[PDB]
Amino acid sequence: EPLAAGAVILRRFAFNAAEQLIRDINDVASQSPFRQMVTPGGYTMSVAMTNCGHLGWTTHRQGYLYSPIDPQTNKPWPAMPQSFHNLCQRAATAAGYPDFQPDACLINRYAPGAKLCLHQDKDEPDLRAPIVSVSLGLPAIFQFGGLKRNDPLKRLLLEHGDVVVWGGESRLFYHGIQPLKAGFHPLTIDCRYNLTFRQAGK
DNA sequence: AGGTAAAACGT
DNA sequence: AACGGTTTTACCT
Ligand SMILES: O=C(O)CCC(=O)C(=O)O
Ligand SMILES: [Mn+2]
């Protein structure tokens, strides 16, 4: 059984590419550091984030925004690593989205207990473009629902190297990550990373 | 009028 | 601890 209409999980798709992806996460973070963003309501997110590529997802007092500039450093986000772009392209093609051209990569870091409450990815103007989501390190429970918040949830363990792609009919589906369980991974030591690729511009 | 804020406590 | 209330409102454009 596939995940949803226009959605698929590619298990261990990024396993072989993982070590290089993690080196490149470190390189990106050396320029635009991980930070826990503050919601408009004034709460600090448990997930630490940074971005690469032309546009980066951020919180602001007025809401959420994709920006070409890191508001912390006041410099552009680091360029999207070739390893990121190549993996994303291969995953998108395998998932049935061969024309996907991302211009934005959000890098999430989960410490033990870190979560991402059920939400939609909707800050992007071109809804024809899919989401490519790459898991690295410690395993996490991914929630995948429907168009409405109360739509029944699928719960899927996402392990190191797993790639999830959604778009088309499932593009605006609610999804999230349950509080991360503590553990060890030889490549990340004590955390989970996630790479979320999007077309956020035109 | 529609979009977005909640990507964030009680049972 | 899975589910759902809150946005059951307050501001922008
Ligand atoms: O960490 C994940 O697997 C999901 C991340 C996510 O939903 C997001 O960054 O919008
Ligand atoms: Mn998301």
Nearest residue CA, atom 3 of ligand 1?
A: A194
**A96 Rama sector, left if φ>0, alpha if ψ -120 to 50, beta otherwise:** left
**Listed resolution, Å:** 1.7
Q: Which residues pair with A61 in a beta bridge?
A: none
Number of domains, chain A: 1
Distance A198 CA to B6 C1' (A): 22
CB–CB of A117/A191 below 8 Å?
no
CB–CB of A87/A19 below 8 Å?
no
Beta-carbon contacts of residue A101 (< 8 Å; ≥ 6 apart): A129, A199
For residue A35, give its domain range.
Answer: 1-202
Question: Does residue A124's CB lie within 6 angstroms of at least one atom of ligand 1?
Answer: no
Phi, psi (5° rounding) for residue A4? -165, 175
Per-residue buried b or exposed e for A75-99, using 16+ beta carbons within 10 Å of the residue's own CB: ebbbebbebbbebbbbbbeebebee
Substitution site in A39, A196, A197, A198 for ligand 1 pocket (most atoms within 8 Å of beta carbon): A196
**What's the CATH number where A34 sits?**
2.60.120.590
Cα–Cα distance, A162 to A34 (Å, whole number): 22
Nearest ligand 1 atom to the CA of A194 is 1
Strands A104-110 and A163-166: unpaired
